[PDB]
Design a protein around this ligand. Structure first.
Ligand SMILES: *[C@@H]1O[C@H](CO)[C@@H](O[C@@H]2O[C@H](CO)[C@@H](O[C@@H]3O[C@H](CO)[C@@H](O)[C@H](O[C@H]4O[C@H](CO)[C@@H](O)[C@H](O)[C@@H]4O[C@H]4O[C@H](CO)[C@@H](O)[C@H](O)[C@@H]4O)[C@@H]3O)[C@H](O)[C@H]2NC(C)=O)[C@H](O)[C@H]1NC(C)=O
Ligand SMILES: *[C@@H]1O[C@H](CO)[C@@H](O[C@@H]2O[C@H](CO)[C@@H](O)[C@H](O)[C@H]2NC(C)=O)[C@H](O)[C@H]1NC(C)=O
Ligand SMILES: *[C@@H]1O[C@H](CO)[C@@H](O[C@@H]2O[C@H](CO)[C@@H](O)[C@H](O)[C@H]2NC(C)=O)[C@H](O)[C@H]1NC(C)=O
Ligand SMILES: *[C@@H]1O[C@H](CO)[C@@H](O[C@@H]2O[C@H](CO)[C@@H](O)[C@H](O)[C@H]2NC(C)=O)[C@H](O)[C@H]1NC(C)=O
Ligand SMILES: *[C@@H]1O[C@H](CO)[C@@H](O[C@@H]2O[C@H](CO)[C@@H](O)[C@H](O)[C@H]2NC(C)=O)[C@H](O)[C@H]1NC(C)=O
Ligand SMILES: *[C@@H]1O[C@H](CO)[C@@H](O[C@@H]2O[C@H](CO)[C@@H](O)[C@H](O)[C@H]2NC(C)=O)[C@H](O)[C@H]1NC(C)=O
Ligand SMILES: *[C@@H]1O[C@H](CO)[C@@H](O[C@@H]2O[C@H](CO)[C@@H](O)[C@H](O)[C@H]2NC(C)=O)[C@H](O)[C@H]1NC(C)=O
Ligand SMILES: *[C@@H]1O[C@H](CO)[C@@H](O[C@@H]2O[C@H](CO)[C@@H](O)[C@H](O)[C@H]2NC(C)=O)[C@H](O)[C@H]1NC(C)=O
Ligand SMILES: *[C@@H]1O[C@H](CO)[C@@H](O[C@@H]2O[C@H](CO)[C@@H](O)[C@H](O)[C@H]2NC(C)=O)[C@H](O)[C@H]1NC(C)=O
Ligand SMILES: *[C@@H]1O[C@H](CO)[C@@H](O)[C@H](O)[C@H]1NC(C)=O
Ligand SMILES: *[C@@H]1O[C@H](CO)[C@@H](O)[C@H](O)[C@H]1NC(C)=O
Ligand SMILES: *[C@@H]1O[C@H](CO)[C@@H](O)[C@H](O)[C@H]1NC(C)=O
Ligand SMILES: *[C@@H]1O[C@H](CO)[C@@H](O)[C@H](O)[C@H]1NC(C)=O
Ligand SMILES: *[C@@H]1O[C@H](CO)[C@@H](O)[C@H](O)[C@H]1NC(C)=O
Ligand SMILES: *[C@@H]1O[C@H](CO)[C@@H](O)[C@H](O)[C@H]1NC(C)=O
Ligand SMILES: *[C@@H]1O[C@H](CO)[C@@H](O)[C@H](O)[C@H]1NC(C)=O
Lengths: 441, 110, 130, 126, 75, 130, 48
């Protein structure tokens, strides 16, 4: 009675969630763009009407791929240049007390040692300046890593500056972008589009603060996998940036020592002039306004009549416990204690100065047995950056007290990638379909 | 410039009545012509394109016909939302010339 | 004939359109399907895509619709699968919604198509024997 | 959905130059699109000023206004600019910016797209 | 290449003569001067700037034929 | 109806069966054909399998049996190839034995099929010229 | 027994100065040279 018959169509627009391997698209650097395809000048985007999709930032496979690719590029970058095997020798060190301040006492050591030369039957007496965090007493000291592994020296010609990278899907796959504002990373998105490649993402490495990121288009956003649970980090995205000015003002000097055939080690000769502490500056009023916005947004989830406290970090390693980053090729670790120190109750030109320490032996990723040595940078260095987000953690969270305390967090770098790929997902097409029509074979 | 004349200047009709309007061109324009609808305080809305194709979403009551220098819009069943200013546009050769427009108003008891 | 530009529909451009309108853009979707360790990954992805395309073509050929984008068949449509009429399907619904609705009636349809094709081939072979 | 928004001064003195901007959102101008400037007044009704081609930059103007009009565009800023010098009292009108194009799949027509802005009122007086 | 051949309805064939008529603008030479006095390379060189329109015409003709056949089978 | 089991025939399940019974299970074998240094070896094997499948499909298309598992042809059967009647072939022999028997008459049959297809194509082209 | 097919009535265009085979041959020769020298001694201690 129906007199309707099955009909097969190939090429229908139907898709489903899937996982694949996206490839490069980017316009000497550690993040090698040589193995990445050039990007198109005019990317195309197709807005899909009447299409409501499901999104969830906390189970995105692209973050893992980005992390693996970044680690792989970092590993390949350090291969073709010198390794500092002979640097593990006993050092004779003294204190540096030539035009130093009260807060820089004991942070520098003038060390002397013996070293090999281009001829294996000759030795040379050399000296250098080392940081207190890089030497451990054995008047005789040794490098901190000598009992774990040998560090591969960072390679002078390359630069650590991040560059944008775009990820593109292969054939048979599509990338869907959610264009809905106020989207908190999980749930249904009504406004959807299809894009060939994602926007340029800078792989910035930092802890306790997101630098040179993206800003919210509406207001401050708070995201968490389970806000009730206190074991999950909270990602805060600003709507305007906060300028921060970091600087190392010492006039460093660099010298080269030939340790073998075509192998040179770069050492710090001497500091010209006075010796002072590297430090960062951040505006006070802007930080206060940003904290006001953040606590206002937090009151939405944590009650309208709750006292919100910002306190210091709990403890642990220096990297997790301090704001760690790279400026001008030098590795800074800043003590962010003057920022997250306040309490909020429901109801001119001075700036906050954060002291910082410089480090040379680096374990960038959470790995043991693979260190890296950064050669010194000649001359004064300064940099300016935008703060556009925070990674917070709730302390305790019991019902005994009505006060909520938040502390800075970090450590895991995947979160830094999660703050950028939150509005993207990958799907794969199903071209085969069956419908009713009134033919008959 | 290709002169375009719309007739009648105005016409009162009731709901459900059949309305016809004509657009004449000084020179031949083949089938390059559009009919737009514009309510007071609102921008023009496309009603017919190429003088014989119904725009997506437009109710099927409206229709267009003709060619050369003679075109016609027909409203088979006038509705309360159909009372507006109907404009005839030609784009065969520059410059574009809009017609004077035809005003359709509700006819009701005194 | 002067004053209007022209653009080309992109990939998945008719996703939100109705089934009747979306069925007129099958070629744009069909054409897109074909086209150290990272090289291995890329080659594996390409080989997997080629294998998927070949499998789809073989499945289409098994039903007797080889080399066709639209191929309406002899299998009648059961009312249990969907009671909606054509007017409510090809003019008021999209392909995604249709796939969602009848997601749990596909394997039986495929089996019926295979059996119908086998029966048709057997009947044709018997007819040609005369 | 493609949206066009007009912005410009509300009052222009006689003999001065009116500079109007039309911002387009939801679509790009680098493609093959036709962008037209229109004005509506009680005494003249809808009147076509000119139009421009995004890809080729070819511009056409109404002859009667051809000596007093200029149309340009900025693809990077996604805007279309109109300049009208030697303003007079007769130029008081509501200005609209419109876009027209159509879609194809090979050699088969798929859709016909036109969009109009909300309009901006401009009055000329000393 | 196989997919492109299939799109025109000439699937599984090496020679498949179609319904699209030949325009004189593409070439004015008669059959005798083409199939008996010319090679494939020269022919490809001559009509190198008329191929895309022919492909589009073939695709449109195949689409029209498929639509007509579907309409015919509806009775 | 209650108390009867059901199973599915496996790959090469009809190897020992007769030709007539084995010819009803072509799809089970047809489907199976499609689906650091070790990765290279596996990728090479996959590419070789794809190439073999494509070559077989091209040969089938050249013979004029594209997109078919059973295809009738116009080439008559010569008695020199085999004098056995149908009853002794389809009901008393297996495919392996048949392949062993006529292993030395295959290329000539392939050439005859190709020539017959060429002649048929030429005749059809001549007929369509009117 | 290598095979060659002489093409009659075919005149081609040739240019030795833009041949891609030379670059491939150079790269292959350098690569083979690099591979050949791997599995035997390195003269590190000779510098005395
Ligand atoms: C957030 O973004 C902002 C802006 O995008 C970042 O700030 C920019 O940071 C870059 C990199 O530090 C900086 O560019 C440098 O400017 C210096 C001053 O002009 C230059 O001297 C420097 O060039 C040296 O380094 C290059 C490698 O990066 C070398 O290729 C080059 O040859 C130079 O090296 C010479 O000099 C050194 C020192 O004497 C010597 O050792 C070498 O042998 C060689 O002789 C860069 O061009 C931008 O100027 C910054 N922009 C602003 C506005 O401040 C910021 O860093 C980002 N935040 C984070 C956390 O990354
Ligand atoms: C680090 O120690 C070295 C060696 O003691 C210092 O180099 C000496 O500097 C004095 C004064 O400039 C010279 O008279 C010596 O000849 C230098 N010794 C050598 C071996 O060259 C160096 O100045 C010290 N640096 C700091 C910052 O204290
Ligand atoms: C570099 O090597 C020399 C030679 O081995 C060291 O000088 C010796 O030091 C030891 C330990 O104090 C003494 O017992 C020897 O008498 C020294 N020999 C000579 C010839 O001076 C020197 O100390 C080494 N340098 C450093 C920084 O340790
Ligand atoms: C978010 O976290 C809370 C706290 O852990 C979850 O609630 C707990 O769930 C466990 C499950 O075994 C219970 O044992 C606890 O008693 C619960 N505690 C409270 C305070 O409810 C909650 O389920 C999590 N949210 C989701 C969606 O899983
Ligand atoms: C951070 O702020 C301090 C002040 O709190 C700055 O110190 C001043 O630096 C300027 C440099 O132009 C000197 O002229 C002043 O004499 C300094 N004053 C004091 C009290 O130290 C410091 O320069 C700032 N650093 C950065 C990188 O912005
Ligand atoms: C960070 O440094 C920038 C300049 O590198 C500072 O910008 C200056 O701000 C002052 C206001 O006190 C203005 O008068 C100057 O004109 C600005 N200069 C430039 C080049 O923009 C900025 O104020 C610094 N921020 C902090 C927190 O120290
Ligand atoms: C946050 O502030 C507290 C105090 O305001 C710091 O605690 C001090 O830590 C230093 C270093 O161990 C001790 O010498 C002091 O005695 C501590 N003070 C108190 C009152 O306990 C804490 O270290 C700060 N957080 C960080 C990460 O530095
Ligand atoms: C980070 O900065 C804070 C603030 O200066 C440090 O806390 C001070 O630590 C010293 C230790 O010598 C105490 O004497 C001060 O009383 C502390 N300040 C306050 C307000 O309690 C903190 O120690 C710094 N972090 C580290 C790791 O040293
Ligand atoms: C810090 O943020 C400001 C504001 O977002 C940046 O200044 C903007 O830079 C973009 C560059 O694409 C311009 O299009 C905007 O017009 C700028 N806005 C303003 C108000 O200047 C600034 O470049 C950022 N700095 C860093 C280092 O990222
Ligand atoms: C160097 O200075 C530090 C800090 O003042 C002190 O603890 C250490 O004993 C000094 N070492 C010397 C003078 O050898
Ligand atoms: C190396 O020495 C440091 C300090 O003496 C110590 O903390 C670390 O555990 C040592 N490494 C190993 C592998 O024992
Ligand atoms: C915010 O995230 C929660 C997570 O459970 C989700 O339920 C909610 O829908 C999100 N907000 C919006 C506006 O979708
Ligand atoms: C650092 O020292 C060098 C060498 O004396 C000098 O040329 C340079 O100006 C110094 N840097 C500054 C910031 O004065
Ligand atoms: C922390 O805040 C208190 C006021 O609540 C202030 O007395 C103290 O100095 C602050 N400490 C730092 C390191 O900013
Ligand atoms: C989207 O849905 C609305 C109503 O559900 C419909 O009018 C519109 O045509 C749909 N969009 C498209 C592109 O068909
Ligand atoms: C195996 O051979 C025996 C005797 O030749 C026959 O009866 C039997 O049917 C054969 N097996 C199958 C599966 O046909």
């Amino acid at each position: 009675a129906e007199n309707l018959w099955v009909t097969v169509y190939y090429g229908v627009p139907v898709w489903k969630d899937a996982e694949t391997t996206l490839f490069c698209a980017s316009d000497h650097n550690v993040w090698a763009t040589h193995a990445c395809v050039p990007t198109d000048p005019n990317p195309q985007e197709i807005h899909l009407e009447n299409v409501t999709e499901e999104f969830n930032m906390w189970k995105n496979n692209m973050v893992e791929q980005m992390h693996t690719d970044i680690i792989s590029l970092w590993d390949q970058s350090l291969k073709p240049c010198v390794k500092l095997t002979p640097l593990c020798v006993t050092l004779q060190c003294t204190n540096v007390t030539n035009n130093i301040t009260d807060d820089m006492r004991g942070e520098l050591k003038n060390c002397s040692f013996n070293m090999t030369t281009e001829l294996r039957d000759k030795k040379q007496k050399v000296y250098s300046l080392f940081y207190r965090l890089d030497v451990v007493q054995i008047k005789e000291y040794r490098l901190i890593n000598c009992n774990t592994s040998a560090c591969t020296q960072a390679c002078p010609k390359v630069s650590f500056e991040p560059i944008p990278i775009h990820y593109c899907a292969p054939a048979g796959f599509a990338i869907l972008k959610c264009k809905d504002k106020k989207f908190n990373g999980t749930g249904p998105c009504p406004s959807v589009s299809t894009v060939q490649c994602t926007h340029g993402i800078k792989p910035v490495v930092s802890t306790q603060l997101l630098l040179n990121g993206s800003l919210a288009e509406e207001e401050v956003m708070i995201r968490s996998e389970n806000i009730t649970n206190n074991a999950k980090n909270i990602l805060v995205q600003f709507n305007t940036p906060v300028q921060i000015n970091c600087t190392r003002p010492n006039n460093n000097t660099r010298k080269s020592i030939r340790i073998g055939p075509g192998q040179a080690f770069y050492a710090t000769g001497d500091i010209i002039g006075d010796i002072r502490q590297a430090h960062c500056n951040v505006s006070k009023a802007t930080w206060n306004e940003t904290l006001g916005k953040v606590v206002k947004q937090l009151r939405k989830h944590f009650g309208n009549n709750t006292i919100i406290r910002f306190a210091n970090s709990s403890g642990g390693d220096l990297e997790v416990t301090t704001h760690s980053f790279n400026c001008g090729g030098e590795f800074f670790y800043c003590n962010t204690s003057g920022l997250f120190n306040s309490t909020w109750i429901s109801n001119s030109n001075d700036s906050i100065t954060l002291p910082c320490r410089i480090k040379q032996i680096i374990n960038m990723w959470q790995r043991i047995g693979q260190c890296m040595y950064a050669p010194p940078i000649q001359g004064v260095i300064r940099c300016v950056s935008n703060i556009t987000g925070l990674i917070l953690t709730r302390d305790g969270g019991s019902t005994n007290s009505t006060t909520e305390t938040f502390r800075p967090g970090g450590g895991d770098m995947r979160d830094n990638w999660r703050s950028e790929l939150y509005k993207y997902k990958v799907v794969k097409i199903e071209p085969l379909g069956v419908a009713p029509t009134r033919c008959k074979r | 410039d290709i002169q375009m004349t719309q007739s009648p200047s105005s016409l009162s009709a009731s709901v459900g009545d059949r309305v016809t309007m004509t657009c004449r061109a000084s020179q031949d324009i083949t089938t390059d012509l559009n009919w737009y609808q514009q309510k007071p305080g609102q921008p023009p809305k496309l009603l017919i394109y190429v003088a014989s194709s119904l725009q997506n979403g437009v109710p099927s009551r409206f229709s267009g016909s003709g060619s050369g220098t003679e075109f016609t819009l027909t409203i088979r069943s006038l509705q309360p939302e159909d009372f507006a200013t109907y404009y005839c546009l030609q784009y065969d050769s520059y410059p574009w010339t809009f017609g004077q427009g035809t005003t359709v108003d509700f006819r009701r008891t005194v | 004939a002067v004053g209007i530009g022209a653009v080309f529909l992109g990939f998945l451009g008719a996703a939100g359109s109705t089934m009747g309108a979306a069925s007129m853009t099958l070629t744009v979707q069909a054409r897109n399907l074909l086209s150290t360790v990272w090289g291995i990954k890329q080659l594996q992805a390409r080989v997997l895509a080629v294998e998927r395309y070949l499998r789809d073509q073989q499945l289409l050929g098994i039903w007797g619709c080889s080399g066709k984008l639209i191929c309406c068949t002899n299998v009648p449509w059961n009312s249990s699968w969907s009671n909606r009429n054509l007017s409510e399907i090809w003019d008021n619904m999209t392909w995604l919604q249709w796939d969602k609705e009848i997601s749990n009636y596909t394997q039986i349809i495929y089996g019926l198509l295979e059996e119908s094709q086998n029966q048709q081939e057997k009947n044709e072979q018997d007819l040609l024997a005369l | 959905q493609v949206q066009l928004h007009e912005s410009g001064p509300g009052l222009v003195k006689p003999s001065e130059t009116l500079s109007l901007t039309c911002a387009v959102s939801g679509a790009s101008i680098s493609g093959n699109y036709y962008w037209n400037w229109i004005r509506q007044s009680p005494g003249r009704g809808l009147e076509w000023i000119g139009n421009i081609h995004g890809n080729g930059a070819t511009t056409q103007y109404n002859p009667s206004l051809k000596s007093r009009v200029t149309i340009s565009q900025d693809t990077s800023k996604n805007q279309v600019f109109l300049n009208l010098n030697s303003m007079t009292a007769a130029d008081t009108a509501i200005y609209y910016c419109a876009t027209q194009f159509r879609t194809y799949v090979g050699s088969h027509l798929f859709s016909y797209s036109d969009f109009w802005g909300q309009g901006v009122l401009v009055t000329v007086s000393s």
